[PDB]
Write a protein that binds this ligand. Structure first.
Ligand code: HEM
Ligand code: HEM
Ligand code: HEM
Ligand code: HEM
Lengths: 141, 146, 146, 141
């Protein structure tokens, strides 16, 4: 589970992200679309080129949802309640895909926060993203 | 794995700047730290009680160097990874009985380590090419299972 | 996949008693019911609103028959599943973009359906041989991904 | 999540298992060891042959833990608290393995309860075993 230390690590690392949250969100998406092509099937109405305003705008949305999760890390189920319904019921996103996005998010942070991405924080972030993923697919199991 | 000319260029160019004494130990250590069950395979390595104990473990640093060597080798024989890892596959599969999902996890941790070491240089396209490589290595290592 | 003489015997012997008009539809329907996200691939099949609607869907029953046909084919060419599913692989991989994990899930649901239909006859050893077969088919279907 | 209907399906199906719970538990283990050889590495001290009293005795233990989970399906985390520590901290069981055992359990029920293993109950059982699995590996994420 998310231990007191994990909670602290996540809050600190995310705190470092600061204003670049939206940018890193767009970057993780772009990394996912390129490394894992299957994920693109979910975004037909999206132009997934490099300067895409659609991907830029969506990254901001993903970032804000994670900020919400960090701010309410002890009641994520409630906080993310609406997003689960969206991804599960409406979008039918394959559970496997949350792991690909999670990995791409970790890769983006590693590329932007050398000092913070220690093995310890890395493990905390992984558990955190794993917890966000569990909630978003909870309308399955 | 089939890499485009521009992709092989990206990969190799990056792999050359790689710190062989560092990267390998960092990847294996982070795997043991981030995915604790993997520690059941290296109990003989000593104390893996804490991340600092894991990252400072010389046995971990040393084995890591070996692992990274396997990747370089796979890098040279992308047209024949199956033949290149046949012996390693037999080792991890028939002898150690490591679940194939863990080869995938190590590959991704390796990707994270490269991103951490190269920062901006590790662009999305470059990661895309590396994901293809680690994907190939993981399949090759698992080939003794199918 | 390499099956022992006693294993191929177990598999084929069972596959002969299989209800081709039943089994196939039951497996695909249960997949859509048990793993809801898979429904995004068969929206054109009509109403998959409820399990009874899914299991009673003629399009589901019909496609299932096709799927089961592919398995029989794989059963005849175990020594060359990759070549046997090349066209299907291209279809599911390059065209549909179905994640490979789902080929594994369908194979296991198929195993559940056989156990349900054969009861005691589906002993652990027999299941063991079938798990090897569906494991091979899933890899072959995914081969266009690696 | 486990809906009111899921809860009902699980309670009913498990109710059918009745006294054979221990037997089916041993059978699922045997099915797992045979179909997925890697799992055997966790049982060195076990004779995994067909009539093994060790496997017979252990199947009873697995069955009782699932009975506990069904009896306290609304507070599984607490009920199974001790087993998680065992499998995660002490045994270091690879998470992937819970899916193999789960599948083998579903296969064993399908082979023993034709009338009950309907697509609906099948889906309920899968979510249930998925929930038991999540708890047993919670000392990870
Ligand atoms: C870390 C997990 C994820 C988070 C935090 C997240 C967050 C979001 C948010 C906040 C939205 C916008 C909701 C709104 O407009 O009200 C959204 C939309 C969406 N997400 Fe995710 N998402 C995640 C993972 C995924 C994955 C793995 C996929 C698929 C590969 C996916 C596919 C979509 C799609 C298709 C939409 C709707 C886009 C549109 O039509 O505008 N999401 N997501
Ligand atoms: C990308 C996948 C991997 C590669 C390329 C790799 C490579 C290697 C190499 C080069 C060796 C040295 C073998 C020798 O001495 O000839 C080795 C040993 C070993 N590997 Fe891996 N490995 C991989 C994944 C894993 C994973 C994920 C685990 C377990 C969680 C693992 C467990 C072991 C063990 C226990 C040994 C020690 C064997 C011994 O020397 O006694 N490996 N591996
Ligand atoms: C064991 C794995 C599977 C086998 C052997 C299999 C086999 C088949 C076969 C024989 C067809 C008919 C294609 C034709 O008309 O030539 C087909 C079509 C299709 N399959 Fe699969 N399939 C498998 C898994 C899946 C999974 C897991 C999904 C998605 C969750 C899926 C989605 C599709 C779709 C959407 C079609 C319809 C294509 C069309 O005819 O327009 N299949 N499959
Ligand atoms: C549905 C999930 C599972 C349940 C309900 C379950 C339940 C149990 C129970 C009740 C015990 C005995 C605890 C005691 O003696 O106090 C146990 C022990 C153990 N389990 Fe599990 N288990 C599950 C899955 C697994 C899996 C997937 C593995 C590994 C492939 C595993 C490996 C073990 C081992 C090695 C022991 C200790 C055996 C011994 O030394 O006596 N378990 N499990």
């Amino acid at each position: 589970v998310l231990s007191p230390a994990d909670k602290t690590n996540v809050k600190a690392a995310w705190g470092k992200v600061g204003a670049h949250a939206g940018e890193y969100g767009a970057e993780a998406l772009e990394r996912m679309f390129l490394s894992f092509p299957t994920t693109k099937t979910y975004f037909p109405h999206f132009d997934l080129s490099h300067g895409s305003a659609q991907v830029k705008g969506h990254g901001k949305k993903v970032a804000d949802a994670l900020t919400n999760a960090v701010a309410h890390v002890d009641d994520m189920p409630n906080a993310l309640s609406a997003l689960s319904d969206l991804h599960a019921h409406k979008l039918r996103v394959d559970p496997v895909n949350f792991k690909l996005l999670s990995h791409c998010l970790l890769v983006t942070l590693a590329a932007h926060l050398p000092a913070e991405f220690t093995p310890a924080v890395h493990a905390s972030l992984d558990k955190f993203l794993a917890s966000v993923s569990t909630v978003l697919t909870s309308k399955y199991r | 794995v089939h890499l485009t000319p521009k992709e092989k260029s990206a990969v190799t160019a990056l792999w050359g700047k790689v710190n062989v004494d560092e990267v390998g130990g960092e990847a294996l250590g982070r795997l043991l730290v981030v995915y604790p069950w993997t520690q059941r395979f290296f109990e003989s390595f000593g104390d893996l009680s804490t991340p600092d104990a894991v990252m400072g473990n010389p046995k971990v640093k040393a084995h890591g160097k070996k692992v990274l060597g396997a990747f370089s080798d796979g890098l040279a024989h992308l047209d024949n990874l199956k033949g290149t890892f046949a012996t390693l596959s037999e080792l991890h599969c028939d002898k150690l009985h490591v679940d194939p999902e863990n080869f995938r996890l190590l590959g991704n941790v390796l990707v994270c380590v490269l991103a951490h070491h190269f920062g901006k240089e590790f662009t999305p396209p470059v990661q895309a090419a590396y994901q293809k490589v680690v994907a190939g290595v993981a399949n090759a290592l698992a080939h003794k299972y199918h």
